[PDB]
């Protein structure tokens, strides 16, 4: 029969010993189903999909995806309910990934369904799935309560609410965790009057539950309930729950509360935030666990930012700053690391006077700290503080630390300060840079870490694009040309890198007048790496150079280099000649 032949080839594939052929067949089932047509596809789907269930879970995953997108094959809403029975068995299966793939597909197709079909077929299906005797079916049914709620009738809504309450009251914890996770979405779908009537009793039971995982999931879901509930009601509705969660003995619950502290502050309301969340935050900041302290340090800024600016600074100076000071000298790497990155953004929030009075000594301590992680964060975020404090005051306060950190053993620390140097160069002026910051750039250039050298070259380009070309011509070119004499070939490559980088801003005239003869002299070096890099620089500066010089000086040299024994050098000289089209 027309329906039978595609069903037969699929059977042959299912009976095939090679699982790969079966996987290829189920992955290419979409087209086979296109051929069947509305009349034969649906007649094939019910019996065949029940058979496919008895296959590798990987094969089950393949059809899961296929079905999730097979709305076109069914005539439409009229025939979509035929897809429900297979999906139901695919959702109730043991393996987690296929169950997740099924429930999400069910959620996706739930919208395409008509309300009459929803009440007629989807509601009995979800009732059966929630009433299943195994935990996988209950966990799957946890995910369909929200989607079907807005279109069913009031009696069906009450029945769904009762089934959800029964699922939340389940003795199995795996089911409770799935219900706690979906509680926020269900409350979002649920009406405010119905939320206060049913969501709050179900939520309190979970918050007070002995299991820690269901507790942390509850405190995470509390954000949505706090959003929906009026602010006036939150004082007597969820505030006891938040206090219990903050004072919970399990550190995981406290960590989850700390992670979402900013969301709770935003949802509850700024006024209620200061009255009921400031002692809690102070206690959470001063906790006996490292992770909660780390999480708290991360939100230190967001919590300060979302405070009402009416007394925000007072609140910080009176309650936050003492906690931060205590936390700065904490004997843990993670808390210091997180606080260092977050603390910089607090400068503008605090009044300008407060920064110099309190943030700068804390910053100098974090800069002098032996810990490598804290200092690197401070330097990376050091860009913001420049605006809050006048440059003359800022330079006096941090330059002592900057000049000590410029020679820090860790290359990553040096890499960051090099990147930040352009800002100080522009802010202070050319005279300041020449007087004290130039030797730092030179020592950075001659450093033995290649990454440091590349960063120094990029820095050189960044300061020369704003400090003027003539200034570098009269001050930097004589200094850099000296480095070519260095015995190591590696340091000679640094000279070539900087010649290549600054040629663009110096222009053809300067390149020909002073550094072109230096490159020409360096070209005669014995090391093949030097000859290989000379050719590279000559190719790059060739467009900058005039055609007459190219032919007069560059061409004959490239011709000699092409005759060099080293295949590597000859090849690159030929490439440079072709690029410049001199030959």
């Amino acid at each position: 029969d027309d329906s039978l032949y595609p069903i037969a080839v699929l059977i042959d594939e299912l009976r095939n010993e090679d699982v790969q052929l079966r996987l290829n067949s189920i992955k290419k089932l979409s087209t086979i189903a296109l051929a069947l047509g509305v009349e034969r596809t649906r007649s094939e789907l019910l019996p065949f999909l029940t058979d496919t269930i008895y296959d590798e879970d990987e094969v089950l995953l393949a059809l899961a995806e296929q079905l999730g997108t097979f709305t076109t094959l069914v005539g439409g809403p009229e025939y979509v309910h035929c897809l429900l029975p297979p999906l139901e068995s695919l959702a109730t299966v043991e393996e987690t990934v296929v169950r997740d793939k099924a429930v999400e597909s069910l959620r996706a197709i739930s919208h395409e369904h008509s309300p009459s079909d929803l009440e007629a077929h989807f509601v009995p299906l979800v009732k059966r799935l929630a009433g299943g005797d195994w935990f996988t079916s209950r966990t799957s049914a946890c995910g369909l309560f929200s989607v079907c709620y807005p279109r069913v009738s009031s009696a069906v809504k009450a029945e769904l609410r009762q089934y959800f309450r029964n699922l939340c009251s389940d003795d199995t914890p795996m089911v409770r965790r799935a219900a706690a996770s979906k509680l926020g979405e269900f409350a979002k779908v649920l009406e405010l009057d119905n939320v206060k009537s049913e969501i709050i009793p179900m939520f309190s039971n979970l918050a007070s539950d002995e299991q820690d995982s269901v507790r942390l999931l509850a405190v995470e879901a509390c954000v949505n309930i706090a959003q929906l509930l009026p602010q006036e009601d939150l004082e007597a509705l969820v505030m006891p729950t938040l206090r219990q969660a903050a004072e919970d003995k399990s550190w995981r619950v406290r960590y989850m509360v700390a992670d979402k502290f900013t969301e709770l502050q935003k949802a509850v309301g700024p006024e209620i935030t200061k009255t009921d969340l400031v002692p809690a935050f102070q206690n959470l900041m001063k906790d006996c666990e490292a992770e909660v302290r780390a999480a708290a340090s991360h939100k230190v800024k967001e919590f300060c930012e979302n405070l009402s600016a009416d007394c925000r600074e007072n609140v910080i100076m009176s309650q936050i700053l003492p906690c931060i000071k205590e936390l700065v000298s904490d004997a843990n790497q993670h808390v210091k690391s997180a606080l260092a990155s977050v603390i910089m953004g607090l400068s503008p929030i605090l009044g300008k006077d407060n920064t110099i009075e309190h943030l700068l000594p804390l910053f100098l301590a974090q800069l002098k700290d032996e810990c490598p992680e804290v200092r690197l964060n401070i330097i990376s975020n050091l860009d913001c503080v420049n605006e809050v404090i006048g440059i003359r005051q800022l330079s006096q306060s941090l330059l002592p630390a900057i000049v000590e950190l410029a020679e820090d053993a860790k290359w990553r620390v040096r890499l960051a300060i090099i990147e930040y140097m352009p800002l100080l160069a522009g802010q202070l002026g050319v005279e300041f840079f020449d007087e004290k910051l130039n030797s730092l750039c030179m020592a950075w250039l001659v450093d033995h870490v290649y990454a440091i050298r590349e960063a120094a070259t990029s820095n050189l380009k960044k300061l020369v694009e704003k400090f003027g070309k003539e200034w570098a011509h009269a001050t930097i070119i004589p200094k850099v040309l000296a480095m070519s004499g260095d015995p190591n070939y590696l340091h000679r490559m640094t000279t070539l890198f900087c010649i290549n980088v600054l040629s663009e801003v110096c222009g053809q005239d300067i390149t020909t007048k002073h550094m072109l003869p230096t490159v020409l002299r360096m070209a005669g070096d014995p090391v093949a790496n030097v000859r290989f890099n000379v050719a590279k620089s000559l190719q790059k500066i060739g467009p900058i150079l005039d055609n007459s010089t190219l032919q007069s000086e560059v061409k004959p040299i490239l011709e000699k280099l092409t005759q060099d024994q080293d295949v590597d050098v000859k090849y690159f000289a030929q490439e440079a000649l072709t690029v410049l089209s001199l030959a």
């Binding site: 080839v9 052929l21 069947l36 914890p173």
Partner: protein
């Protein structure tokens, strides 16, 4: 942190106030002290507590009625408060990301004190004067679940103590056995489907093995379904090598109790056969051989065809450890007896795989074992070996026609003879 009061020796005081000094001591040691922030502080308090604990573990089973109705809550309470303190996070282990052997186990910062307390609690349960009926009013399901939750710690020693005390509780308390089994179902389901990380799996499997060894009654449906949906799904986890022996012992125990459960176990193992990992393939072959040793000939025949098919598949593997373990099956005399019985079906499957890999492998030992197996097959039966040989040479030429016909026909019917000339309009892209 509290200053202990001056106390006397328990054996010196008369037995009249011995229990009053004992419950006061249980209250004094109820107080905890820091051991991870400042272990230097309260040294006097620490050594006083240690000296008290040492006297207590000795006092047990060294006096009449050392444990009585008023003593049962105080002993449970002191053990509960110290043991049920929230476990710290695995900061340095990074949640045991590194192998459990490679990762340094976090040894209890106060292990000596904890060891003493665990020793005292075991002496309490074992003591003849201990009564389960009196204690059942006080030890409840919350105590059991807290003790089970504690199994996640790293120190192997404290895990062993937890296993021992759990075994003692299970043996003494008859009424909580079903609840303990249910909680072990949950701690296993959660680990297999949600977390995938745990350290107490081996101890729990050891506890289960004793319970299966004590399943004198014919297995009830709950035990059967638990074996079919907890123990067998445990082979999916990547950490199988951590608790492999315990799981092997448990599987064999269940099959010894009921051999009718053999066929499904074999199908579950074949379904969960690892393809990427070799160590897992090794332990899977070990498990198969252990099971193969106790199989009744009747049950074996039901699943000989797919088991040996998988075996022929694994032999082809270039891995030398996998190849040698599969070829070591010929050492076990029972497996030789099983094949001598079922050669007519068994040889046509093993023979082509053995011939194909006869010269492909690089290792000398693998080649030696393959030749040994080849000689064994023609020795046991010459005519059957010749028939398998002629069938193999026939298949070596027929495979071309098979591959040509199977591949062409499938693609044609798949879409060429269907998607293109049937419902073309409905067919898209």
């Amino acid at each position: 942190p509290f200053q202990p009061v001056v106390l006397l020796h328990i054996r010196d005081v008369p037995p009249a106030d011995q229990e009053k000094l004992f419950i006061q001591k249980l209250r004094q040691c109820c107080v905890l002290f820091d051991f991870v922030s400042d272990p230097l502080s309260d040294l006097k308090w620490k050594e006083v507590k240690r000296a008290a604990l040492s006297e207590m573990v000795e006092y047990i089973t060294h006096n009449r009625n050392v444990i009585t109705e008023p003593i049962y809550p105080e002993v449970v309470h002191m053990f509960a408060v110290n043991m049920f303190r929230t476990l710290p996070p695995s900061s340095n282990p990074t949640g045991a990301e590194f192998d459990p052997e490679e990762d340094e186990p976090t040894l209890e910062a106060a292990w000596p004190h904890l060891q003493l307390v665990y020793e005292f609690f075991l002496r309490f349960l074992e003591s003849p004067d201990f009564q389960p009926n009196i204690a059942k009013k006080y030890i409840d399901q919350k105590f059991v679940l807290q003790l089970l939750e504690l199994f996640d710690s790293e120190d192997p020693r404290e895990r062993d103590f937890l296993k021992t005390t759990l075994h003692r509780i299970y043996g003494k308390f008859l009424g909580l056995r079903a609840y303990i089994r249910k909680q072990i179902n949950n701690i296993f389901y959660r680990f297999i489907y949600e977390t995938e990380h745990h350290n107490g799996i081996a101890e729990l499997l050891e506890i289960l093995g004793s319970i299966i060894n004590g399943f004198a009654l014919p297995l009830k449906e709950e035990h059967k379904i638990f074996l079919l949906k907890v123990l067998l799904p445990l082979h999916k986890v990547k950490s199988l090598s951590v608790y492999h022996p315990q799981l092997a012992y448990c599987v064999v125990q269940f099959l010894e109790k009921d051999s009718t459960l053999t066929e499904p176990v074999v199908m579950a193992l074949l379904k969960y056969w690892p393809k990427t990992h070799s160590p897992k393939e090794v332990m899977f072959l070990n498990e198969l051989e252990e099971i193969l040793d106790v199989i009744e000939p009747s049950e074996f025949v039901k699943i000989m065809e797919p088991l040996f098919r998988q075996l022929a598949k694994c032999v082809s593997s270039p891995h030398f450890q996998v190849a040698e373990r599969a070829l070591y099956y010929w050492n076990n005399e029972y497996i030789m007896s099983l094949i001598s019985d079922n050669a007519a079906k068994i040889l046509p499957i093993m023979f082509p795989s053995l011939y194909r890999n006869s010269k492909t492998h690089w290792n000398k030992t693998i080649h030696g074992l393959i030749y040994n197996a080849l000689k064994l097959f023609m020795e046991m039966n010459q005519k059957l070996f010749d028939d398998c040989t002629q069938q193999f040479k026939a298949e070596k030429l027929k495979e071309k026609l098979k591959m040509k016909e199977r591949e062409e026909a499938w693609v044609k019917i798949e879409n060429l003879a269907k998607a293109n000339p049937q419902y073309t309009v409905y067919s898209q892209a």
